[PDB]
Amino acid sequence: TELALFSRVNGKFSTEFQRMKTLQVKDQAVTTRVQVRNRIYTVKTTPTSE
Amino acid sequence: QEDHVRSSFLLDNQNSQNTVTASAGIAFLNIVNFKVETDYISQTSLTKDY
């Protein structure tokens, strides 16, 4: 605002309002599953076992 | 061997800017003078991923 009266009386009135905001969200979810199954031999009993 | 990979990316973004500059200046014959101005800047961003 600028107000000049009689070309001699001056008045200035300068206002400012800055308002900044910031929001960040980060989510993360890692799932891992390893299943291993070896089967090497198969051991059976002879029918002639005592 | 069977392999499957499925990726999915989603991204969204939105910006909104408003500016309002309203001024009024009255100037008489070097007796009364009144100058006013109003500036209003607003700006919102928003990004969202997945």
Swiss-Prot record, chain B:
Induction field: By CSF1 in fetal liver macrophages. By interferon-alpha, by interferon-beta, by interferon-gamma and by bacterial infection with E.coli and M.smegmatis in embryonic fibroblasts.
Lineage top rank: taxon: Eukaryota
Subcellular location per UniProt equals: Cytoplasmic vesicle membrane
* Annotated coiled-coil segments of the chain: none
Q: Which residues cross the membrane?
A: 19-28, 32-40
**PTM per UniProt?**
Proteolytically processed in two steps to generate the Macrophage-expressed gene 1 protein, processed form: cleaved by trypsin in proximity of the helical transmembrane domain releases the ectodomain into the lysosomal lumen to orient the pore-forming domain toward the endogenous membranes, and processed by the asparagine endopeptidase (LGMN). Proteolytic processing in antigen-containing vesicles is pH-dependent.
Describe, from its UniProt entry, the tissues in which this protein is expressed: Expressed constitutively in a variety of cell types including macrophages, microglia, neutrophils, T cells, marginal zone B cells, keratinocytes, splenocytes and intestinal epithelial cells.
Q: When this gene is knocked out, what is seen?
A: Impaired immunity characterized by a failure to efficiently prime CD8(+) T-cells to cell-associated antigens. Defects are caused by impaired cross-presentation of cell-associated antigens. In normal conditions, mice do not show any obvious disease phenotype or a change in immune cell frequencies.
Quaternary structure and interacting proteins, as annotated: Homooligomer; predominantly forms a homooligomeric arc-shaped pore complex instead of complete rings of 16 subunits.
Q: What is known of its domains?
A: The MACPF domain includes the central machinery of pore formation: acidification causes a significant structural rearrangement, leading to oligomerization and deployment of the transmembrane beta-strands (named TMH1 and TMH2) that enter the membrane as amphipathic beta-hairpins.
Function, please? Pore-forming protein involved in both innate and adaptive immunity. Plays a central role in antigen cross-presentation in dendritic cells by forming a pore in antigen-containing compartments, thereby promoting delivery of antigens for cross-presentation. Also involved in innate immune response following bacterial infection; shows antibacterial activity against a wide spectrum of Gram-positive, Gram-negative and acid-fast bacteria.
What's the family? Belongs to the MPEG1 family.
The name on file for this protein is Macrophage-expressed gene 1 protein
Natural source organism: Mus musculus (Mouse)
Upper taxonomic classification of the species? Eukaryota, Metazoa, Chordata, Craniata, Vertebrata
- Residue window of the full protein shown: 217 to 266 of 713
